[PDB]
Each structure stands twice: as structure tokens, then as C-alpha cells.
């Protein structure tokens, strides 16, 4: 029954800074919550029990604050190996029950993504099925929006993204979108646009090409 | 001496169960709680229940009741889970983990702290059988070139289960590559792209194959990457 609730949801910071994050409890854990540190692939470690108590191992700049229902992270001269997913889980009653997290990736300067397009292969088209590629290349912030365009109609429900880690040497997310339709459907329109939103563009971005060029 | 060793990856059809393993050492098996906690793919943390192994006391969330059996087996040193009737919904990483009651001296399962955590064992739910990817050119064209360089890849569709490895020019190429993570498709098949940015001057004179390699299905697919009239 105890909803855990986190802010920000994800946070840029720099090495050296002093970042401080919150979770929530729907009611009152006293001091029954701990907090955790996950990184991509791996398991969940403990770093916060008893609301401020210090795991053994745990560097001290990580710091809990708070009893009833709002409680702390202070994480205070951030290193390299801190950028990473936090979690705070109720540990007062069962079901025990975790915030949502809130990631602490990399800030840099704001860079808008290069964006290219791609049609479907001959090859694919034969057999019947047609996916159309958006790359948003080397951007920052993460924050990004694509709409699909065909014949200037927008698209709903046929198309799927995925984004790559934040790149280890310029800090930058690039972000790939499939937008999928059979051959039939393909063939009857002319212009495939995608339409590109995000922070370091002045206004959003659209490429296109006409099918059969 | 702390160690949660978990079975290894699972991959069932929907109907069937999964029976994962959470090897301990000596003494957390002995004194505490070993609790299971889920995480579907991009997801948070669910509670599934927990088990006092000494005894075989086991308490389980609501929301699994019915379909989950926590069990513990001393001659061992092992916890299992057993969650039947899987659905897709059900994919995900399954932990086990140590409730430790610090400051706490009476009580196994208050406070519940997990201070330690097994590695997960991942079980992936689907009708799918194992095959092989579909590879198609993501083919450079005017519209895929910013300033003096230009994009291309390969479209890695349709194959089951993860992963699929990508490589380019037999591995000579890593500079400018990103291969992204592949989406579950509404067909129970995944699907993944893999970019590469090279200089617009050499489309000319050097050809770009990308490399994909599916373990599962024994199969590769080398792609040679063209340029396109758009």
C-alpha cells in the first residue's frame, strides 16, 4: 500500500558538485528507509539504512536525511563512479516498495542532435515489410521528441525508439527511430518526414525524402 | 564469505514457470531473510516475498500470491523461486537479496533492508522460437551526410533471443559506432539498429560491411553498405 515517490526523476550534475535528491513515502516509515545505488547491468547496492545510517564501505560524501515522509540523498563532491540510478525503498511494512529513481548522468554544454534518414532497403521491400530510419545523432540534454510525417499526416502507434548510454569521452545520447509499415501501405504515400524537437534547436528540425529517388 | 549465486538466464513460453536458484554462503543462509525482487526492462523494483530459510517461513506480495512459491533447502545452502503461469509481462531480472534487521536484534524481516544482493538471473517470456536476424543497409544518401561526413548502418530485424553482436569492417572500424539497444517488436522478435559516421570522400573508394553475429542461431550475416540515389 506505500507509495514511494522520487524528484528530480534524473539530474545533471559535474564532478565536484553537490547533488541532492528526495523520495516520498504515502505515509509515515519513521526512519525505516534505505536507499540504493544501481548501475546499468548490475545489481542494486545498499549505501543509506536507517534513513541517514552509513553502510559499511560506503564513501561518506553519500548522506540520508529525514524521518515520517520526506527523506534526503546528498551525495556531496560527486566522483566519476557516482553517476549512476539512485533508489529508496520503504523498509517499514510489507510490501516492501521502492521509489522510481532518479538518474544522475553527465552534464556538458548543450549540443543539438545531427539528424539523418534512411528509406527501407530494396531487399526488405520485397519481402513485404518497410521500416524507415531516424538517427538523432550526439545530442545533450537526453530530453528529445520524434514525430513521423507521411504526407505531411502524422503517425501514432507504428513506430518504436531506442537511446544509447551517455558516451564515456563527449557526453552525448544518440537515439535511433523505426517507423514500420507493411509494403501496401508504403507504397501509397510519397514523403516520409521526421520531425525533430529538442532544447539546443531553435525550432524543431525535419528531414525527408520522397520515396522512389 | 557474503555471496548470492544465482541460475543462470531463462527463456520460457507463456504458461510454463521458472524455477530460479540463489546459492548463500553458510552463514546468511543461517541468521536472516532472503527476499526476491524483480526488474522488468527499464523498470523499477518489485517486491515478490521472502523466505526464512532455516524454517521455510515464506511471505509473499499480494500481487504474486498464487503464482509464486519461495522455498529453502539447508543441505544446500539455497533458496528458490518458482513463479508459474508466466505471462510476457513477467520478463525481467530476478534477485534474490539479504534482509538484514540492523539496528534490530528481534525479528527476521523488520526493518527490511536488502544489504546485500545476488547478480539476477534474467528470464525472458515469449512465444518465440530462436531465429536468426534480418539484416538490411541503412544506406548513406544526401540525406544522411552533415558538413563533410556521412551516416550509415545496418537494421538488425526480427531475431530472437538477445543479443546480437555488431561489428564493422571486420572490426577495423570503432570510431564513430553506435550500436543501440534492440526493441521488443509487437511479434515477440527484437530488432536493433547499428550507425556508424565516416567521411563523405571515401563512399567513393572504401566500402563498409557491417558484421552480425547471433550466437543462439548460429548465424552471421556480413551487409555491405551502399550508397542510395536519395
Known amino acids: 500500500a506505500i507509495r514511494m515517490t522520487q524528484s528530480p526523476s534524473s539530474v545533471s550534475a559535474s564532478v565536484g558538485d553537490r547533488v541532492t535528491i528526495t523520495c516520498r513515502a504515502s505515509?509515515?516509515?519513521?526512519?525505516?528507509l534505505a536507499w540504493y545505488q544501481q548501475k546499468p547491468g548490475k545489481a542494486p547496492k545498499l549505501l543509506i539504512y536507517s534513513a541517514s545510517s552509513l553502510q559499511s564501505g560506503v564513501p561518506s560524501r553519500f548522506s540520508g536525511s529525514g524521518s515520517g515522509t520526506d527523506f534526503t540523498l546528498t551525495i556531496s563532491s560527486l566522483q566519476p563512479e557516482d553517476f549512476a540510478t539512485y533508489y529508496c525503498?520503504?523498509?517499514?511494512?510489507?510490501?516492501?516498495?521502492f521509489g522510481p529513481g532518479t538518474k544522475v548522468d553527465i552534464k556538458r554544454t548543450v549540443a543539438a542532435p545531427s539528424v539523418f534518414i534512411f528509406p527501407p532497403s530494396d531487399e526488405q521491400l520485397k519481402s513485404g515489410t518497410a521500416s524507415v530510419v531516424c538517427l538523432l545523432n550526439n545530442f545533450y540534454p537526453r530530453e528529445a521528441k520524434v514525430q513521423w510525417k507521411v504526407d505531411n499526416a502524422l503517425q501514432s502507434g507504428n513506430s518504436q525508439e531506442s537511446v544509447t548510454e551517455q558516451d564515456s569521452k563527449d557526453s552525448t545520447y544518440s537515439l535511433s527511430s523505426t517507423l514500420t509499415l507493411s509494403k501496401a501501405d508504403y507504397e501509397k504515400h510519397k514523403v516520409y518526414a521526421c520531425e525533430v524537437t529538442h532544447q539546443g534547436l531553435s525550432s524543431p528540425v525535419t528531414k525527408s525524402f520522397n520515396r522512389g529517388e | 564469505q557474503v555471496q548470492l549465486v544465482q541460475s543462470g538466464a531463462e527463456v520460457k513460453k507463456p504458461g510454463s514457470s521458472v524455477k530460479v536458484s540463489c546459492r548463500a554462503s553458510?552463514?546468511?543462509?543461517?541468521?536472516?531473510?532472503i527476499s526476491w525482487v524483480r526488474q522488468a526492462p527499464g523498470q523499477g523494483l518489485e517486491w515478490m516475498g521472502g523466505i526464512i530459510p532455516i524454517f521455510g517461513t515464506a511471505h509473499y506480495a499480494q500481487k504474486f500470491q498464487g503464482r509464486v512459491t519461495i522455498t529453502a533447502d539447508a543441505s544446500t545452502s539455497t533458496a528458490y523461486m518458482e513463479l508459474s503461469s508466466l505471462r510476457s509481462e513477467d520478463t525481467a531480472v530476478y534477485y534474490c537479496?539479504?534482509?538484514?534487521?540492523?539496528?534490530?536484534?528481534?525479528?527476521?524481516?523488520?526493518?527490511?533492508?536488502?544489504?546485500?544482493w545476488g547478480q539476477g538471473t534474467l528470464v525472458t517470456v515469449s512465444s518465440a522460437s530462436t531465429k536468426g536476424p534480418s539484416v538490411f543497409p541503412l544506406a548513406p544518401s544526401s540525406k544522411s551526410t552533415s558538413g563533410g561526413t556521412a551516416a550509415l548502418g545496418c537494421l538488425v530485424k526480427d531475431y530472437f533471443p538477445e543479443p546480437v553482436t555488431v561489428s564493422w569492417n571486420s572490426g577495423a572500424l570503432t570510431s564513430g559506432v553506435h550500436t543501440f539497444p534492440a526493441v521488443l517488436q509487437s511479434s515477440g522478435l527484437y530488432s536493433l539498429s547499428s550507425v556508424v559516421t565516416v567521411p563523405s570522400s571515401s563512399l567513393g573508394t572504401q566500402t563498409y560491411i557491417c558484421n552480425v553475429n547471433h550466437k543462439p542461431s548460429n548465424t552471421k550475416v556480413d551487409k555491405k553498405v551502399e550508397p542510395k540515389s536519395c
Open positions: 525503498q520503504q523498509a517499514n511494512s510489507f510490501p516492501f516498495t
Open positions: 553458510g552463514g546468511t543462509f543461517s541468521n536472516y531473510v
Open positions: 537479496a539479504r534482509i538484514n534487521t540492523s539496528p534490530i536484534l528481534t525479528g527476521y524481516y523488520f526493518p527490511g533492508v536488502h544489504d546485500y
Open positions: 505515509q509515515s516509515i519513521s526512519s525505516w
